[PDB]
């Protein structure tokens, strides 16, 4: 699964997805965290 109650939303929900992308992308822009999980 990749959605909680997105179904409830008709079109507006779409915008939500877009926003999410930003956050995710930013993550790849800062792989520094890798060091943490790593040794």
Curated annotation (Swiss-Prot):
Q: Which top-rank group of organisms is this from?
A: Eukaryota
Mind telling me which residue stretches traverse the membrane in this protein? none
Main function: (Microbial infection) Forms amyloid beta-sheet fibrils in semen. These fibrils, termed SEVI (semen-derived enhancer of viral infection) capture HIV virions, attach them to target cells and enhance infection. SEVI amyloid fibrils are degraded by polyphenol epigallocatechin-3-gallate (EGCG), a constituent of green tea. Target cell attachment and enhancement of HIV infection is inhibited by surfen. Also similarly boosts XMRV (xenotropic murine leukemia virus-related virus) infection.
Its protein name is PAPf39
């Amino acid at each position: 699964g990749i959605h909680k109650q997105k179904e409830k939303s008709r079109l507006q929900g779409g915008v939500l997805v877009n926003e999410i992308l930003n956050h995710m992308k930013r993550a790849t822009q800062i792989p520094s965290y890798k060091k943490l999980i790593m040794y």
